[PDB]
Enzyme design. Structure first.
Site, mmCIF file in Angstrom:
data_model
loop_
_atom_site.group_PDB
_atom_site.id
_atom_site.type_symbol
_atom_site.label_atom_id
_atom_site.label_comp_id
_atom_site.label_asym_id
_atom_site.label_seq_id
_atom_site.Cartn_x
_atom_site.Cartn_y
_atom_site.Cartn_z
ATOM 1 N N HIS A 158 0.770 -1.240 0.000
ATOM 2 C CA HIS A 158 0.000 0.000 0.000
ATOM 3 C C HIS A 158 0.791 1.275 0.000
ATOM 4 C CB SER A 182 -0.665 -2.398 -8.234
ATOM 5 N N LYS A 198 -14.101 -5.761 -11.282
ATOM 6 C CA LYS A 198 -13.122 -6.707 -11.803
ATOM 7 C C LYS A 198 -12.921 -7.868 -10.849
ATOM 8 N N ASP A 199 -12.659 -7.523 -9.601
ATOM 9 C CA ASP A 199 -12.460 -8.524 -8.566
ATOM 10 C C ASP A 199 -13.665 -9.434 -8.395
ATOM 11 N N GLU A 236 1.478 -33.859 -3.791
ATOM 12 C CA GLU A 236 0.411 -33.382 -4.667
ATOM 13 C C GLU A 236 0.958 -32.420 -5.713
HETATM 14 C C1 HEM Z 1 -0.940 -16.288 1.047
HETATM 15 C C2 HEM Z 1 -0.678 -16.037 -0.227
HETATM 16 C C3 HEM Z 1 -0.834 -14.666 -0.880
HETATM 17 C C4 HEM Z 1 -1.877 -13.826 -0.959
HETATM 18 C C5 HEM Z 1 -3.317 -14.041 -0.449
HETATM 19 C C6 HEM Z 1 -1.454 -12.682 -1.719
HETATM 20 C C7 HEM Z 1 -2.165 -11.605 -2.103
HETATM 21 C C8 HEM Z 1 -1.876 -10.541 -2.827
HETATM 22 C C9 HEM Z 1 -2.764 -9.611 -3.507
HETATM 23 C C10 HEM Z 1 -4.279 -9.707 -3.307
HETATM 24 C C11 HEM Z 1 -2.014 -8.751 -4.201
HETATM 25 C C12 HEM Z 1 -2.402 -7.581 -5.124
HETATM 26 C C13 HEM Z 1 -2.599 -7.943 -6.603
HETATM 27 C C14 HEM Z 1 -1.523 -8.498 -7.470
HETATM 28 O O1 HEM Z 1 -0.484 -7.878 -7.762
HETATM 29 O O2 HEM Z 1 -1.632 -9.658 -7.950
HETATM 30 C C15 HEM Z 1 -0.623 -9.117 -4.033
HETATM 31 C C16 HEM Z 1 0.469 -8.492 -4.604
HETATM 32 C C17 HEM Z 1 1.788 -8.869 -4.443
HETATM 33 N N1 HEM Z 1 2.192 -10.049 -3.864
HETATM 34 FE FE1 HEM Z 1 0.991 -11.431 -3.022
HETATM 35 N N2 HEM Z 1 -0.114 -12.809 -2.061
HETATM 36 C C18 HEM Z 1 0.279 -14.030 -1.549
HETATM 37 C C19 HEM Z 1 1.542 -14.544 -1.753
HETATM 38 C C20 HEM Z 1 2.676 -13.907 -2.213
HETATM 39 C C21 HEM Z 1 4.056 -14.469 -2.232
HETATM 40 C C22 HEM Z 1 4.396 -15.880 -1.796
HETATM 41 C C23 HEM Z 1 4.831 -13.411 -2.585
HETATM 42 C C24 HEM Z 1 6.304 -13.373 -2.905
HETATM 43 C C25 HEM Z 1 7.214 -14.064 -2.245
HETATM 44 C C26 HEM Z 1 3.943 -12.309 -2.934
HETATM 45 C C27 HEM Z 1 4.378 -11.085 -3.374
HETATM 46 C C28 HEM Z 1 3.571 -10.100 -3.872
HETATM 47 C C29 HEM Z 1 4.052 -8.908 -4.505
HETATM 48 C C30 HEM Z 1 5.520 -8.527 -4.760
HETATM 49 C C31 HEM Z 1 2.980 -8.168 -4.885
HETATM 50 C C32 HEM Z 1 2.939 -6.801 -5.622
HETATM 51 C C33 HEM Z 1 3.136 -6.748 -7.134
HETATM 52 C C34 HEM Z 1 2.865 -5.525 -7.878
HETATM 53 O O3 HEM Z 1 1.687 -5.236 -8.112
HETATM 54 O O4 HEM Z 1 3.851 -4.834 -8.232
HETATM 55 N N3 HEM Z 1 2.619 -12.601 -2.761
HETATM 56 N N4 HEM Z 1 -0.573 -10.227 -3.206
#
Ligand code: HEM
Ligand code: HEM
Lengths: 106, 43, 111, 379, 81, 62, 48
Positions: D201, D205, D227-228, D271
């Protein structure tokens, strides 16, 4: 000793740009850079013209991306026109900071 | 990486080793209570 | 937020008090403009191409008089409720509400 | 302000990260996986809590218990098959997430990247213990062989595998442990997610172009709430399509057989989510070498920030990485395949070159390609 | 802090938009999709499809061999001799 | 002139969000029933006599 | 072996139609909300 290879590379460079999205997009190559702390300062150093330009370009670009539409063939960025306008600014910013490190080191 | 390395930095490293050195000793003590080596107990 | 808010409130929640005060304001606005020679001349000229050849001046008070808090509420909801806005700015408009936000401001779920 | 509901409560202001937030315009469909990611976390949980409303965590019963949830209990069948299938989705979604980060350089957000990574690994633990709760032949063995794979560590290992198990094998002691940690991980993980969101935040993005969008920003409420919701709609679709039409399809394991500790499915494997991990271990002769390399599979993620070589955080304008990005993905698919393969010559030799390809793609190829592209652009 | 009034600084740009109720939400979708879908797929295909193709060969070959070597129970070394 | 079907619908039910919502509640109800009815029918047709509903006869009340 | 599956297939048919109908409306509903950004064309204006 680069006359043929580099010559191929020069031809290759145009292809690389053509391959690259920015040329297709019409936005300048310099504008595309990952906005980090050095780019950031370079950015700030831009004249009103250069700098407002980079704002419209990205505006027009993110608009297209939002609509999944490509710009017309006639209006695309041609490799031969590589405004590396950030490069000048960006170099120094780095140059300054590399020094800073040298002075800090000793 | 390269930026971090410097001729000037050495005093900090020397200072760090003692604090670091002191810190290292604590873990051995901490680990040892949990580990309960008969040899460690023998010591 | 406040403005649109005002609109909505207007077509659902107008109170006689409130309408009666605006009423009176109107009269004055409409009487005091007509002070002076230039002012009267424009009303008379423009009135004729606008409203045709009438000079509704004394009528006004009557018309204005028929005003009711229900009248004002039903009349406002024709034009502002559920209707699609026409919004222009000349930035810093970076925070200006998204067209859809403005739009949803013309109906009342919450806010 | 007065009667601006949002900032009145301080609490309700904190919720205006959904409605009022600056969201880039341009934005592939890929980003819906964040949101869906959360969707899945919430669905597993609601589902879990109801299943754990009729499940027992003992040797004797666990199999029975699940069996009873799917037979006598009203709508327990879908709840359970929704829970199983979900977790598939949850992972399918996760790996889209990380792909996107890999490709557009969202991973520049180092702090966000490091949370992601923790996220990924935490879920990974979760999934590994839940699958063992039902205590069926696949589960039983899979736990042994994974856990034991920890006994590779020279000094401790051995002692430590025995602590984790609560004994010498995987009897009741282990079975109730997994039940408890499975239960409590997801709650802990939600805290993490929110912490992840917190950091993100602060910089918003990234986009397909790879450039700041500050000059183009949009209402999250107006646009990105639909969208969501739409994303959901497709997400659910897939989850019910799976759960209603082919309940077992994606759940490779057919072992609905109560675990008999002398018996063994010669074909033991994790799995689909964990399929890649099993394959990585196989290419190395030595046990310990395989455990290190297994960890490095996953743990290699946090390097990529430092590996980044190009000036364009966006792969979008760099062909060559778009080609090696895809290949890694297809190498990853290739590895997943090996996972369900007899550990014999044919598969061995393949996996081994895929496991080198994966680490090359990530460690060495891409980084170079970056440079190249930068040099062709004259950058 | 505040995310909308404080993003960046933008001078001299006009935007023109229309209301939802005045326009159509499905703009010659078949016609745009075909040509746009076509035009990006064909710029993706080359960068994306290869590695998958590759996997398929490797899958195919890789399974043939298995079945052979194992079904060819006499493969390793012949019978007569 | 008369209002297009939509315009009619609009002014009667969608100006006020109270009405709108009321609609949707109502609709959700009506819709669930028709859908089910129709969508169940459709599905039973595809499996004529395959389902116990078809097959209860055999062993029922003699 | 799969008592739930028999019930599931019937449910799946109901689910398939509802999901399809819901998906179509959402794409349309989704399009309208996002139409304004897509519809909008921004033209840079020279400072002088
Ligand atoms: C429990 C699992 C996870 C949930 C529920 C989650 C959820 C989210 C959501 C809802 C967003 C915003 C939309 C998007 O960019 O796709 C986001 C962005 C992001 N997530 Fe995750 N995420 C998870 C796992 C991870 C993992 C394992 C990593 C990296 C090690 C990660 C890194 C990031 C990053 C870097 C962004 C920002 C990207 C950008 O828009 O520039 N996420 N995450
Ligand atoms: C994303 C986090 C979670 C994932 C990946 C996950 C995954 C799994 C998997 C793969 C199984 C094996 C089911 C089978 O194939 O029979 C399982 C079982 C189970 N899980 Fe979850 N689960 C998660 C969260 C939870 C939560 C939060 C709860 C409790 C609130 C829970 C309770 C159970 C129970 C009681 C079982 C045993 C009965 C059965 O087989 O359904 N799980 N879980």
């Amino acid at each position: 000793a680069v006359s043929a290879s580099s010559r191929w590379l020069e031809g290759i460079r145009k292809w690389y740009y053509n391959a690259a999205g920015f040329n297709k997009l019409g936005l300048m190559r310099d504008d595309t850079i990952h906005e980090n702390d050095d780019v950031k300062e370079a950015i700030r150093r831009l004249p009103e013209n250069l700098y407002d330009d980079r704002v419209f370009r990205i505006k027009r670009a993110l608009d297209l991306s939002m609509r999944q539409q490509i710009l017309p063939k006639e209006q695309w960025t041609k490799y031969e026109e590589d405004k590396s306008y950030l490069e000048p600014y960006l170099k120094e910013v780095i140059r300054e900071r590399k020094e800073r490190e040298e002075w800090a080191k000793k | 990486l390269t930026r971090f390395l410097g001729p000037r930095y050495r005093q900090l490293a020397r200072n760090w080793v003692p604090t670091a050195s002191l810190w290292g000793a604590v873990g051995a003590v901490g680990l040892v209570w949990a580990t309960d080596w008969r040899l460690i107990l023998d010591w | 937020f406040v403005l649109q808010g005002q609109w909505m409130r207007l077509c659902t929640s107008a109170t006689e008090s409130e309408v009666l005060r605006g009423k009176n304001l109107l009269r004055n606005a409409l009487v005091s403009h007509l002070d002076g020679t230039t002012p009267v001349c424009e009303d008379i000229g423009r009135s004729l191409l606008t409203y045709g050849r009438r000079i509704p001046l004394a009528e006004w008070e009557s018309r204005i008089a028929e005003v009711d808090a229900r009248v004002v509420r039903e009349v406002c909801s024709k034009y502002f409720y559920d209707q699609c806005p026409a919004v222009a700015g000349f930035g810093p408009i970076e925070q200006l509400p998204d067209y859809n936000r403005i739009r949803s401001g013309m109906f009342w779920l919450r806010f | 302000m007065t009667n601006i509901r949002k900032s009145h409560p301080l609490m309700k202001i904190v919720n205006n990260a959904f409605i009022d937030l600056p969201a880039p315009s341009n934005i592939s469909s890929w980003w819906n996986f964040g949101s869906l990611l959360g969707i899945c976390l919430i669905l597993q949980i609601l589902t879990g809590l109801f299943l754990a409303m009729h499940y027992t965590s003992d040797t004797t019963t666990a199999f029975s218990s699940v069996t009873h949830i799917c037979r006598d209990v009203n709508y327990g069948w879908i709840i359970r098959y929704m829970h199983a299938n979900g977790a598939s989705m949850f992972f399918i979604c996760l790996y889209m997430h990380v792909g996107r980060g890999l490709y557009y350089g969202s991973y520049t957000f180092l702090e966000t990247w490091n949370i992601g990574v923790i996220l990924l690994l935490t879920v990974m633990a979760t999934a590994f213990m839940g699958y063992v709760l039902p205590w069926g032949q696949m589960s039983f063995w899979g736990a042994t062989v994974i856990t034991n794979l920890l006994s590779a560590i020279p000094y401790i290992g051995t002692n430590l595998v025995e602590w984790i198990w609560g004994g010498f094998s995987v009897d009741k002691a282990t079975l109730t442990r997994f039940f408890a940690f499975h239960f409590i991980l997801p709650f802990i993980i939600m805290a993490i997610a929110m912490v992840h969101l917190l950091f993100l935040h602060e910089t918003g993005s990234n986009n397909p172009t790879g450039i700041s969008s500050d000059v183009d920003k949009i209402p999250f409420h107006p646009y990105y709430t639909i969208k969501d919701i739409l994303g959901a709609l497709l997400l659910i679709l897939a989850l019910m399509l799976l759960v209603l039409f082919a309940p077992d399809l994606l759940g490779d394991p057919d072992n609905y057989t109560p675990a008999n500790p002398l018996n063994t499915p010669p074909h033991i494997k994790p799995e689909w989510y964990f399929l890649f991990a099993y394959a990585i271990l196989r290419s190395i002769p030595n046990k310990l070498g395989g455990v290190l390399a297994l960890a490095f599979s996953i743990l290699i993620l946090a390097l990529i920030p430092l590996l980044h070589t190009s000036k364009q955080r966006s792969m979008m304008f760099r062909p060559l990485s778009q080609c090696l990005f895809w290949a890694l993905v297809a190498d990853l698919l290739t590895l997943t395949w090996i996972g369900g393969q007899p550990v014999e010559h044919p598969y061995i030799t393949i996996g081994q070159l895929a496991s080198v390809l994966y680490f090359l793609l990530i460690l060495v190829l891409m980084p170079t390609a970056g440079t190249i592209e930068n040099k062709l652009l004259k950058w | 802090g505040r995310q909308f009034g404080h993003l960046t600084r933008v001078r001299h740009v006009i935007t023109y938009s229309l209301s939802p109720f005045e326009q159509r939400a499905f703009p010659h979708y078949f016609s745009k999709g075909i040509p746009n879908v076509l035009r990006r797929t064909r710029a993706c295909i080359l960068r994306v499809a290869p590695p998958f193709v590759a996997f398929y060969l490797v899958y195919t070959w890789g399974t043939q061999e298995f079945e052979k070597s194992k079904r060819k129970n006499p493969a390793a070394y012949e019978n007569d001799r | 002139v008369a209002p297009t079907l939509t315009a009619r619908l609009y002014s009667l039910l969608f100006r006020r969000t109270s009405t709108f919502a009321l609609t949707i509640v109502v609709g959700a109800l009506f819709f669930e029933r028709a859908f089910d009815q129709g969508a169940d029918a459709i599905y039973e047709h595809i499996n004529e006599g395959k389902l116990w509903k078809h097959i209860k006869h055999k062993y029922e009340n003699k | 072996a799969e008592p739930e599956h028999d019930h599931r297939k019937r449910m799946g048919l109901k689910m398939l139609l509802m999901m399809g109908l819901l998906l179509p409306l959402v794409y349309a509903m989704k399009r309208h909300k996002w139409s304004v950004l897509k519809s909008r064309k921004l033209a840079y204006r020279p400072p002088k």
